[PDB]
Amino acid sequence: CTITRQAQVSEASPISGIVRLTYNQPLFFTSRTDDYVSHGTATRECQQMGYADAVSFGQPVGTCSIYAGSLCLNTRFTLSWQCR
Amino acid sequence: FGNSRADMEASGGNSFNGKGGANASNTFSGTLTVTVDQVLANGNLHVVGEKQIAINQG
Numbered sequence: 663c664t665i666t667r668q669a670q671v672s673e674a675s676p677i678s679g680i681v682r683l684t685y686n687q688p689l690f691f692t693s694r695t696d697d698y699v700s701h702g703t704a705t706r707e708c709q710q711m712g713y714a715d716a717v718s719f720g721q722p723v724g725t726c727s728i729y730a731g732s733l734c735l736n737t738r739f740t741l742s743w744q745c746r
Numbered sequence: 747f748g749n750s751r752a753d754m755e756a757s758g759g760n761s762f763n764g765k766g767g768a769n770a771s772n773t774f775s776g777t778l779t780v781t782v783d784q785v786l787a788n789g790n791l792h793v794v795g796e797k798q799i800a801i802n803q804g
């Protein structure tokens with residue numbers, strides 16, 4: 663009902679040094695993995711690339727990914743980081 | 747040819763007509779403001795945008 667986890671990575675573009683992670687939310691569900699695992703993954707991606715010290719710099723973005731009539735079965739939430 | 751031994755009469759016909767066609771048209775006359783998603787290596791911009799309108803009942 664109000665339990666979700668497992669926020670993973672979805673994009674790592676060296677051009678502009680942008681890392682994007684995504685996580686899922688069911689219809690009547692919430693999601694906040696740990697507020698720190700996303701930072702760790704972003705830092706790992708930046709280190710893998712030529713940058714480092716990822717910064718959140720933004721706010722979560724939620725766009726529906728599954729449509730069932732006038733509803734939203736699943737919602738995708740994105741976290742952006744700017745490697746520096 | 748004393749009888750109708752040589753009397754002859756014959757007719758034959760063969761008519762064929764085939765046709766085919768297909769059409770496909772589409773038009774779009776809107777204006778939408780989009781946001782850049784990422785900057786490519788050559789400088790091209792990946793743009794994504796969305797607009798939701800609820801006039802009434804939908």
Ligand SMILES: O=C(O)[C@H]1C[C@@H](O)[C@@H](O)[C@@H]([C@H](O)CO)O1
Pocket residue numbers: none
């Ligand atoms: O010269 C013949 O061979 C003929 C003349 C015709 O009459 C022909 O039709 C046939 C007849 O079938 C005899 O019965 O005979």
